[PDB]
Amino acid sequence: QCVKLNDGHFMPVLGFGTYAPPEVPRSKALEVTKLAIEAGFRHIDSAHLYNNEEQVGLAIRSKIADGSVKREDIFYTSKLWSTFHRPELVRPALENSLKKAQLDYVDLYLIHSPMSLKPVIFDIVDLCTTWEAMEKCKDAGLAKSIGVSNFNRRQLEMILNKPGLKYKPVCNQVECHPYFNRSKLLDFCKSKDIVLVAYSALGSQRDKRWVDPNSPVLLEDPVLCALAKKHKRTPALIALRYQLQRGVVVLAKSYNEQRIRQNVQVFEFQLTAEDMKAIDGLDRNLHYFNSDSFASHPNYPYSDEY
Ligand SMILES: NC(=O)c1ccc[n+]([C@@H]2O[C@H](COP(=O)([O-])OP(=O)(O)OC[C@H]3O[C@@H](n4cnc5c(N)ncnc54)[C@H](OP(=O)(O)O)[C@@H]3O)[C@@H](O)[C@H]2O)c1
Ligand SMILES: O=C(N1CCOCC1)N1CCN(c2ccc(Cl)cc2)CC1
């Protein structure tokens, strides 16, 4: 299934998460993205930060080349890293990601984060100027659609109320799972025809660089475990399926062949209303990404949200 974005284009509601840390070789990003497409994933999420666009773009091109999919059947996202918020740096950053991926266009380009950094050392940029330059990339045909990531409600409103806005963001990609379900923001987005896309929807990869290993492991949650057994699925599948029934597009990273195939099972069953309330009962404001390196930053998004 696919959801119609607010600029007319379509986005598959299940997305492949492509991040893997440095300890993993760049060549597994190629292998696993091919397997993902083979299992039925049509939405692939990447970014400049992830240092894998060559591999991921080659995986897409390899599956166009063997006739398994057509380019228009694939929805590929890249993101504008935070060192490149100044407007004159926006289009070059995008032309860069395209050259790396060896594609003619991304389906989606995002501002990766509102926390601007110098081209831990901070920058001040007017994000409306960055956005105008995002609009120009849509007009040029470089990005079929454009959107934001890690924006809170006030930071989104700044764009939507901009004088002479040409394009609403089509989406906001934010951390979103049963421990941090972003309900209030979700309602805001729905009221504006903006799609919430969930990352770390399986509880994040627990990278010691950003995540407190003392954090509860979402996929070992007792209520999700009980629901997995009721339905004879896995706690991963309950957490993904939770997101689809709330109108959220969900990403899922996995570099394991069995779990990549398992995750597409999310289309094969449904949770009931009481199942959904039980999962709603788990919200506890736990953002796994919780670092000094973001938290003292003038435009920290989790600064609002009280
Ligand atoms: N915009 C941003 O700021 C931002 C931030 C975070 C993530 N993202 C994007 O969203 C994507 C996904 O988020 P994430 O990387 O934090 O990981 P995630 O989807 O939350 O996955 C976390 C771990 O779950 C595992 N997993 C996958 N399927 C499973 C299953 N069926 N059963 C048990 N575990 C399973 C994976 O381990 P294995 O690989 O061993 O299977 C993965 O490392 C990222 O890859 C990236 O594309 C964006
Ligand atoms: O996409 C990112 N990945 C990919 C998922 O695994 C590691 C880091 N990052 C690092 C964490 N990032 C972040 C930025 C703002 C907030 Cl509020 C939370 C996390 C920026 C993007």
Give the helix proportion (percent range): 25-40%
Strand order in the largest sheet: 3-4-5-6-7-8-9-10
Order of helices and strands: EEEHEHEHEHEHEHEHHEHHH
Look at the structure and give the CATH class: Alpha Beta
Oligomer description: monomer
Q: Could you state the CATH homologous superfamily?
A: NADP-dependent oxidoreductase domain
Question: What are the distinct ligands in this entry?
Answer: NADP nicotinamide-adenine-dinucleotide phosphate, [4-(4-chlorophenyl)piperazin-1-yl](morpholin-4-yl)methanone
**What does the largest sheet look like?**
8 strands, parallel, barrel
Overall morphology: globular
How many distinct domains? 1
Tell me the radius of gyration: 18 Å
Instruction: Give the total of beta strands.
Output: 10
CATH topology: TIM Barrel
Kindly report how far apart the N and C termini lie: 34 Å
**SS content category:** alpha/beta
Indicate the CATH architecture. Answer: Alpha-Beta Barrel
The DSSP helix count reads 11
Strand proportion: 15-25%
Give an account of the 3D structure.
The structure is a monomer. The chain has 306 residues and is an alpha/beta fold. It has a single domain, classed as TIM Barrel. Helix content is 36%, strand content 15%. The chain has 11 helices and 10 strands. An 8-stranded parallel barrel has the order 3-4-5-6-7-8-9-10, surrounded by 4 helices. Strands 1-2 form a two-stranded antiparallel ribbon. It is globular. Bound molecules: NADP nicotinamide-adenine-dinucleotide phosphate (NAP) and [4-(4-chlorophenyl)piperazin-1-yl](morpholin-4-yl)methanone (16J). NADP nicotinamide-adenine-dinucleotide phosphate binds next to strand 10 and helix 9. It is classed as oxidoreductase/oxidoreductase inhibitor.
